[PDB]
Design a protein around this ligand. Structure first.
Ligand SMILES: C[C@H](CCC(=O)O)[C@H]1CC[C@H]2[C@@H]3[C@H](O)C[C@@H]4C[C@H](O)CC[C@]4(C)[C@H]3C[C@H](O)[C@]12C
Ligand SMILES: C[C@H](CCC(=O)O)[C@H]1CC[C@H]2[C@@H]3[C@H](O)C[C@@H]4C[C@H](O)CC[C@]4(C)[C@H]3C[C@H](O)[C@]12C
Ligand SMILES: C[C@H](CCC(=O)O)[C@H]1CC[C@H]2[C@@H]3[C@H](O)C[C@@H]4C[C@H](O)CC[C@]4(C)[C@H]3C[C@H](O)[C@]12C
Ligand SMILES: C[C@H](CCC(=O)O)[C@H]1CC[C@H]2[C@@H]3[C@H](O)C[C@@H]4C[C@H](O)CC[C@]4(C)[C@H]3C[C@H](O)[C@]12C
Ligand SMILES: C[C@H](CCC(=O)O)[C@H]1CC[C@H]2[C@@H]3[C@H](O)C[C@@H]4C[C@H](O)CC[C@]4(C)[C@H]3C[C@H](O)[C@]12C
Ligand SMILES: C[C@H](CCC(=O)O)[C@H]1CC[C@H]2[C@@H]3[C@H](O)C[C@@H]4C[C@H](O)CC[C@]4(C)[C@H]3C[C@H](O)[C@]12C
Ligand code: FES
Ligand code: FES
Ligand SMILES: [Cl-]
Ligand SMILES: [Cl-]
Lengths: 359, 359
């Protein structure tokens, strides 16, 4: 049975091995839609080379590479198995991985999808909360692919561009939080502070209208609602780099602040990504929770398990796709509104690519 | 019959008449918890007099004063009537207004509550979303009052310190949004962009861990969920003053950005306050209308009606108080966690004041 419906799982991706680091960075610094640099074609290769050593070291510290593809594949496999039973009218389903800066690239995935002669293609972002710098960037790649190939799609496209409050996603987070709370000494469980952590954004991006912060906040509220506000919490942000202003509080400074104020039992909850990656395995676990935590004299700091291979998460993915198919929606209503201060002409073209699709 | 349960409605307040402006500003600039100024006792009076003319002019433009007390009283009376019926066991109920910078001052209300010989006192903030600079400030006033007079409370205290997603509050916002959408030309309704607007915060405050942005974001999500995402939206922020960085996007810059990009049908929705005040009647209705207008001409820009005297809102207030009474809660779990980077000694003392109250 030839594939009928293709589910393109979009994510930035991460280098699988240390040798993949350089090209990962090179592709990223060459993404004119992601950032604008003077003589970019000359500086991109240079910046990539200068950052490679330190980044390779970070990946070495976590085993030698990113586990994103392994987790994405497991989730994709599980999603497809469920879909073939859930939606027989659109079966057989096939998942395709479309990483923005590593193989398989978004472009390579689309090429394969077209070759397979699919009837429908669904751009399914793996970021539950929409940022023009994450999901937007991947959707732009799809639009740009067809414009560069000078050909129109031979498949009918649509996108699941965000899903910050899907009930099963919320259930997965709540479940993982409860199981991690069970790992704290019973006597300290009620005193545990939950720090939801998500990749930060530069204020220049937040200030133009990026919908990310508000959606991440929505995910946090739903999770706490399901947990019946059992513990106190704060939503903080990690991964800031450079001297420019970014959205705070910073996760590292918040952990230190809490410890210095007597709150030494902390549960970190990555709330904007669904698998382990450099942000959790290195930044939170090693950079912070090993150098900071100790130096601050904390009692117990743990991190909720990433969704990774949780079967319930695969069900969440399948239900999202199933509902999307049955609704006949081309994209979210939110995608039809670009940032009030957007200055990137590709955003409007990408939005139109999806809203104009033949049904 | 003598009152048994007192509900202290907390809000910053606004000057009732132009003559009240000076002292309004004076009390605000003297509040060392809200801000630290060099030789504050000398500069506070000066800055107050310096800004009085400009602020008086703003109020003159909206009729001569703030309507906050009138709306609060109307809401309070409606709330009490419902409470006497909902909770006979805690009746009679009596509402008291406790404004932070204008009469009746928080301190004056507490004095009256104690004179009335109440058995129970509930600090009910009128800000659905918690900010250490709004609700926190009001709660500090209560703690400091008893620290000032030098004597323990003669009433049993508790607080409803936040309620960002109360189901009836959400219904009120949704109802008001739908009623305003019905005022747009039918052919442009679907084109209408919803801009939720809330008072901004300096980034220095956001970065220390203020819970406000995340809670406002939660309110927005719940409202859009009830509206079934009928229109696209963005949460933006207003009222920034000074040269320092504040949380954006700014509401005015967003309206201008939208208009310049073709979205000339906008619905403004004040989402962090429940009555009309300077922010809606002057800033949104007048200032923005005059600042824009030219060149980039808007087609239709309307503002959803503030909750004000909506009887459903009164029901929301009573439901909140009733549920609070039934649960025996002293405060939200969130209040038990101060900002990770809080540097104000009073915050912890205020928290303890409420968590330690005798039942
Ligand atoms: C000017 C540009 C900022 C783009 C903008 O937001 O306006 C910044 C971003 C990346 C910067 C470069 C990177 O930080 C890499 C180099 C760092 C060296 O210390 C200076 C040259 C160096 C080659 C930088 C030149 C310049 O400051 C760049 C190119
Ligand atoms: C800040 C930006 C998202 C918002 C924006 O579009 O500006 C994000 C998207 C991808 C991120 C980059 C990638 O994660 C690759 C690098 C990871 C390193 O740990 C920091 C630098 C690094 C080069 C990151 C800088 C910055 O955090 C990026 C560029
Ligand atoms: C840290 C890295 C330079 C590597 C190094 O020289 O050590 C620089 C190079 C390109 C920079 C990015 C680009 O200038 C694009 C963005 C510019 C914004 O003002 C800040 C975030 C922003 C996303 C920058 C983050 C960071 O300063 C980067 C990623
Ligand atoms: C130094 C202090 C900032 C303290 C803080 O971070 O809150 C700032 C806040 C308000 C400022 C004052 C107000 O802007 C009023 C005056 C404005 C004049 O241009 C200078 C003196 C003037 C009297 C200012 C002195 C100084 O810049 C102040 C006092
Ligand atoms: C920024 C601050 C809230 C966060 C904080 O604590 O810094 C808020 C609380 C009360 C606000 C002030 C009050 O609304 C009174 C004044 C209103 C005027 O329109 C602007 C200046 C004005 C003097 C405001 C400045 C600023 O927006 C304040 C001081
Ligand atoms: C606008 C007003 C008066 C300026 C002047 O008339 O010269 C000034 C005086 C006190 C200032 C505030 C105080 O300095 C306290 C805060 C300091 C933060 O860095 C910005 C917001 C902040 C809340 C300030 C907002 C604004 O600059 C204020 C409210
Ligand atoms: S930057 Fe957000 S739509 Fe373009
Ligand atoms: S400033 Fe937020 S608790 Fe003190
Ligand atoms: Cl990674
Ligand atoms: Cl007012």
């Amino acid at each position: 049975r030839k594939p009928k419906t293709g589910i393109l799982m979009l994510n930035m991706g991460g280098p699988e091995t240390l040798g993949d680091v350089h090209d990962f960075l090179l592709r990223l610094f060459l993404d004119r839609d992601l950032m604008t640099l003077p003589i970019q074609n000359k500086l991109a290769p240079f910046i990539a080379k200068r950052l490679t050593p330190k980044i390779q070291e970070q990946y070495r510290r976590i085993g030698g590479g990113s586990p994103i593809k392994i987790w994405t594949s497991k989730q994709g496999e599980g999603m497809v198995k469920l879909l073939d039973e859930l939606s027989p009218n659109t079966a057989p389903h096939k998942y395709y991985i479309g990483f923005r800066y590593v193989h398989p690239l978004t472009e390579e995935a689309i090429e394969e999808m077209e070759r397979d002669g699919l009837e429908r293609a669904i751009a399914f972002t793996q970021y539950p909360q929409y940022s023009c710098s994450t999901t937007g960037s991947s959707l732009n790649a799809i639009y740009r692919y067809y414009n560069q190939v000078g050909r129109k799609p031979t498949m009918k496209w649509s996108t699941i561009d965000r899903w910050p409050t899907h009930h099963l996603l919320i259930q997965c987070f709540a479940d993982h939080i409860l199981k991690e709370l069970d790992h704290f000494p019973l006597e300290k469980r009620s005193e545990v502070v939950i720090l939801f952590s998500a990749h930060s954004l530069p204020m220049s991006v937040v200030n133009r209208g990026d919908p990310y912060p508000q959606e991440v906040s929505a995910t946090v509220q739903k999770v706490m609602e399901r947990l019946e506000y059992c513990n106190p919490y704060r939503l903080v942000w990690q991964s800031k780099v450079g001297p420019m202003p970014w959205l705070g509080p910073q996760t590292d400074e918040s952990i230190k602040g809490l410890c210095e104020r007597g709150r030494k039992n902390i549960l970190l909850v990555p709330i904007a990504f669904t698998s382990d990656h450099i942000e959790t395995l290195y930044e939170l676990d090693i950079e912070y929770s090993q150098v900071l935590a100790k130096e601050c004299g904390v009692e117990n700091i743990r991190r909720a398990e990433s969704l990774n291979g949780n079967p319930l998460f695969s069900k969440a993915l399948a239900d999202l796709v199933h509902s999307h198919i049955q609704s006949n929606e081309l994209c979210s209503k939110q995608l039809t509104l670009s940032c009030p201060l957007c200055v990137n002409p590709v955003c409007r073209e990408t939005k139109s690519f999806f809203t104009s699709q033949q049904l």
